[PDB]
Write a protein that binds this ligand. Structure first.
Ligand code: DCP
Ligand code: DCP
Ligand code: MG
Ligand code: MG
Lengths: 681, 681
């Protein structure tokens, strides 16, 4: 007799005379949802075998995927799938999946998939015919241990579908050709829903020459302006703005005009690269010198974006063949925070930290639209007709995440990590982005992937450890320690199985073993009793020196398949499906509210949370930056790419506050910073 | 003792108690210019031979051009050149050429060319080694009979230089690829100073689908928006806006949003194609039906831009598989004039008149930034990586003009026309625009050129005939009649010499002779005594039936080299150098004032004009549209492409006035209309 699941949902938004919540009311919502809406609008077939048939016949499922398997095997899988006992844990989780993920009939009126169907098809797709693999992926996803990126989760198997990968990073070179190409990539990538970031640092600055006639270039903005229109023009079906980003080196002469667009470029996001010296200068209240990329090129034969500024600052200041401009470092960071304060951006990439941690030959000069990807890239050369004469290497992202709790809840952690790695790797292998050759090239050369984490705050709460605490820090350090061991063990394996390794391996730190010197010392003993306890209870072995030493041999000898393994992005709405917390930070709220749906909003309580443990769920605001920054650093120690890191502040905070945080971060090893969020309603 | 040439110039701007002008004062200005400024800042070498040497050595002249000739021959030419007796006729003519055309040293401080040097190098360049040709071109240019387009005049021979051609017309196709390419062409062409127009009619309209999901396309504007930024970004060295245009069919569903950008797109110009039916509808106060290009394609397998609307209006109205929208034709033309009134644009291309007059297989769906070029074009197909899989045919302009007076002043009119044609043809042969394959293709396939006219009003005045008059109309009809005969005789010749013809010739009207039926009847007798007189006095024979009949045989048998011959654009500042009137219309003023120079302005009196014949120089305003429109029609009868036609109106004029004029034009055969100019200060 009460079947308004929204109402029921709404009830999570109520507190009783004792500041407690009717969590059950949310479970009632799930129940009414399935009963009043799903079950009734979901299609039931007489058998799976006819269902496939129909789905392929009418144009929904891609038969090419089913065809890599003996159909019996298929059926066996759907059955297992549906036999696993999967339930959604929350009304939003369900509602999200059916309103935006599950496959519907072409007219919208009926559902054709349920969570496990989708799971299955994903498993089938990535396993490319490998049945045991297919089974495992199925298992990993149904257990909650693994959660592929949205773009994969959503399209695998579908006949009419998106691409499986969808954030991309591109260079631009200081000539029109590159520029033209960039704008064209923007168009092609964004029409298909991709997020794309562009490096701008190589471009000659405002005022520089063209064809040896002085004061003629107009710098980056008018280029920013084009990319902007592109993204705005080429939305994705069912969207109005597209998403772009541009990164620019802080020491680039146009830095301030650049920052200035946000005090005008309304939809691209900005990101700024900052080397260590900049910090040095502002400390010692000094002047910042900006070098011309025009000159830099002619005198060094390389582009601004490819030299090491910190390492050649003085040199450069002294080379009179390099024009210099000066602004006040302290004011810089001031402008930086003022903007950040007004609008979240810009992101920040600690260039020196990054390159110093980079195990891969080359430098890293830019990042993605979520500031988590960090990888080398390389120039492309064109022909006057735009035809590539030299196809360089650009970057694209293959993502998925583990839900730490569920991982810890299963002793075979090595299987668990191997699978995800196997799956993301598949995503990479199946990927062939034709519209932008340099992307295709890159993928193909590197098989880079980015395995990421989520639900930390979820986990720690459940185990009664407070976010931020030494218990917490200790755990996050070792968890990531152990995840790294298995992932590289896995990539090593793959190289063996496939008998090849990523391009450049040889020049890498993996090749020489220097990549391990870190692990052959000691941290690795649980700084803490509780943490020691958790791993033990979980039946998981923390990798041991003998293990590392052995893996180091196997790597030096056999190599690894993927040039890059981990990356920790924010976990948008999949997190709700997976029932996990945004990534590894804490909980923007206890009962998160989203402005979605026919009622206006929908409410989402955190995992494992009950009236008897609320005190373990203090929100990000409440926890504040230090603790957050501290958690990410423990993680940053191991993750070869980077992690999206937001700082949440009270609306009373000041730019100095912001700046103190960024310094701390910087001082702490943090590779990069994402947006800064001032609390608002 | 008085050497301010500007002052002296200024004096043309003075009237005496009898409304007369000190024309001589302008000659004094020339004299002081050369004496106080040119001579002193121009470089004299001990001999020509060393001069060449130096100019090649230091990087100014291109030796590759000199190398096609025996150096003695060269020298002989410069000498002849300088021996011809050339003088500029006006202070602006000189001042223009030295401030913007002649070659200076790289630091700006000194001149290295004089009019005849430039003439010579042009002659050498186009003649490509042919000495008699080189001589003739020299002669034709020095006599004033010929005046190549600015881009050629200015760059031929130079080492550091522009392209020789510079207005281009491009299609776009209804898919992203084409769009991307368009924006890239915009960039590449405009960085080098080219004017470029785009067809937009094929693009699916605002609201149409994408990937079979309804209401999803955003039509042309956001595309207009990109092209706009492109042009604005890629100025030409020494310029801030670039120049673009977009054409769109009046019966395209986005027509009104389109017109609406100008009531927001600040720098592209607009142009509208209009078929006859539109006129029919508005007469009979009817509704205009707009057909979807999306549908049109699917149902007819061709793009909006390639079907004949007039011819299939009803059909289309009846095909229910073609979506239709309706707006009121009368209001259309109303909006058209209101905009025109506010801002000059849009240009107008009378599609049916044009295609009906078109001697060439195919249809004509767009025009250039000056509305004078009209030629067929064809789609290009791309690969997902932008690579052309099928290179279509797009259009570019090779222009030059004859100065009617000087032409008439020399009995060998056939030599005179043959040369120009030979020279423009050279421009075409030497042209290889790599950044846009479809342009290169087009040129190569067609060798289209556009020989044009100027100084009509100049001529008629001198011979005491009033602009507009039956004398005038009669002359312009026969002059163009005779120019056509010789140009086609010339192109015919070329095909023979070169032993090939333009692509498609066979499908042309030249091939079947229908191109001549017009000339084999009769008009061609001077309607007038004076006109008969002028040709006679000039020693020029008006082509005779036997002549046409003979040329028709030679053409049917041997073919012609160029697919298109004539085109009559406005003659911007070269006109001042050549000492002629903007094209064939009359004289925006008696003493034209330009806002140029260190004094703020510079004054330019019309050719042959003196206090004893002012009454023959009534300005365009004063003459008004009819007479103008009437002159162009006489011309439109013969010119295979089209002619830029501005109507000048009093600031009291009304949109109805404007609309009456456009109707007259339309009714009169006029192929197209350029901007409408309201008189302002
Ligand atoms: N009309 C132009 C031409 C170039 N640029 C900009 C874009 C590039 O960042 C930079 C270099 O363009 P190119 O390398 O194509 O320029 P060139 O190679 O012709 O000149 P240079 O050799 O001077 O670099 O100048 C511009 O804004 N407007
Ligand atoms: N994200 C997108 C995709 C397309 N278009 C526009 C530009 C083109 O005029 C038209 C056609 O683009 P494509 O042909 O590339 O579209 P498809 O071929 O994928 O779809 P269809 O086959 O539906 O035409 O749609 C757009 O505005 N935004
Ligand atoms: Mg360059
Ligand atoms: Mg299409």
């Amino acid at each position: 007799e009460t079947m308004d699941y929204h109402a029921l949902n709404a009830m999570l938004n109520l507190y009783d005379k004792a500041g407690h919540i009717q969590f059950d009311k949310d479970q009632q919502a799930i129940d009414a949802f399935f009963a009043t809406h799903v079950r009734p609008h979901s299609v039931t077939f007489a058998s799976q075998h006819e269902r496939l048939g129909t789905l392929v016949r009418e144009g929904y499922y891609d038969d090419a995927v089913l065809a890599r398997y003996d159909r019996a095997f298929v059926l066996r899988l759907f059955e297992h799938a549906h036999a696993s006992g999967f339930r959604f844990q929350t009304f939003l989780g369900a509602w999200k999946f059916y309103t935006s993920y599950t496959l519907k009939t072409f007219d919208g009126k009926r559902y054709l998939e349920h969570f496990e169907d989708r799971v299955t098809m994903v498993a089938l797709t990535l396993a490319q015919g490998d049945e045991t693999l297919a089974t495992q992926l199925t298992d990993e996803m149904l257990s909650g241990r693994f959660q592929p990126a949205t773009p994969t989760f959503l399209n695998c198997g579908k006949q009419q579908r998106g691409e499986l990968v969808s954030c991309f990073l591109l260079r631009i070179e200081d000539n029109m050709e590159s520029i033209g190409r960039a704008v064209n990539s923007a168009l092609q990538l964004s029409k298909r829903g991709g997020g794309v970031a562009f490096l701008l640092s190589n471009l000659r600055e405002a005022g520089a020459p063209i064809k040896r006639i002085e004061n003629q270039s107009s710098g980056v903005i008018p280029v920013m302006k084009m990319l902007e229109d592109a993204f705005s023009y080429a939305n994705q079906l069912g969207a109005r703005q597209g998403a772009g980003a541009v990164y620019l080196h802080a020491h680039h002469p146009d830095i301030l005009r650049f920052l200035d667009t946000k005090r005008r470029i309304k939809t691209l996001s900005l990101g700024v690269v900052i080397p260590d010296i900049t910090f040095r200068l502002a400390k010692e209240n000094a002047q910042m010198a900006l070098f011309s990329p025009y000159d830099i090129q002619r005198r060094y034969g390389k582009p601004f974006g490819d030299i090491a500024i910190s390492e050649r600052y003085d040199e450069l200041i002294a080379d009179p063949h390099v024009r210099k401009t000066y602004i006040n470092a302290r004011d810089f960071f001031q402008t930086l925070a003022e903007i950040q304060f007004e609008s979240g951006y810009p992101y920040i990439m600690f260039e020196d930290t990054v390159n110093r941690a980079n195990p891969i030959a080359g430098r890293i000069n830019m990042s993605n639209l979520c500031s988590e990807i960090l990888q080398v890239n390389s120039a492309s050369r064109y022909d006057d007709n735009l035809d590539y004469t030299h196809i360089g290497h650009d970057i694209s992202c293959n993502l998925g995440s583990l839900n730490i709790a569920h991982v810890m809840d299963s002793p075979d952690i090595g299987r668990t990590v191997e699978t995800a790695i196997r799956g993301l790797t598949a995503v990479s292998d199946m990927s062939h982005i034709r519209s932008v050759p340099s992307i295709a090239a890159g993928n193909a050369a590197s098989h880079a992937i980015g395995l990421g984490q989520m639900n930390l705050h979820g986990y720690l709460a459940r185990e009664g450890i407070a976010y931020g605490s030494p218990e917490a820090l200790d755990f996050t350090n070792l968890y990531f320690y152990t995840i790294t061991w298995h992932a590289v063990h896995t990539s090593m394996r793959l190289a063996r199985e496939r008998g090849k390794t990523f391009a450049g391996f040889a020049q890498s730190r993996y090749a020489s073993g220097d990549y391990f010197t870190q692990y052959l010392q000691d941290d690795w003993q649980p700084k803490t009793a509780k943490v020691r306890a958790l791993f033990a209870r979980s039946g998981i072995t923390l990798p041991t020196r003998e293990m590392w030493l052995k893996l180091r041999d196997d790597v030096m000898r056999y190599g690894i398949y993927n040039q890059n393994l981990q990356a920790v992005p924010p976990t948008g709405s999949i997190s709700y499906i997976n029932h996990a917390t945004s990534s590894i930070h804490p909980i923007v709220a206890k009962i998160e509210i989203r402005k979605e749906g026919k009622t206006g909003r929908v409410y989402y309580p955190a995992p494992f949370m009950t009236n008897e443990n609320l005190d373990m769920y203090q929100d990000a605001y409440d926890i504040g930056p230090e603790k957050i920054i501290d958690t990410y650093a423990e993680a940053t120690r191991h993750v070869d790419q980077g992690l999206s890191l937001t700082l949440f502040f009270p609306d009373t905070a000041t730019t100095r506050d912001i700046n103190k945080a960024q310094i701390y971060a910087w001082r702490k090893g943090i590779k990069s910073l994402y947006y800064i969020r001032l609390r608002q309603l």
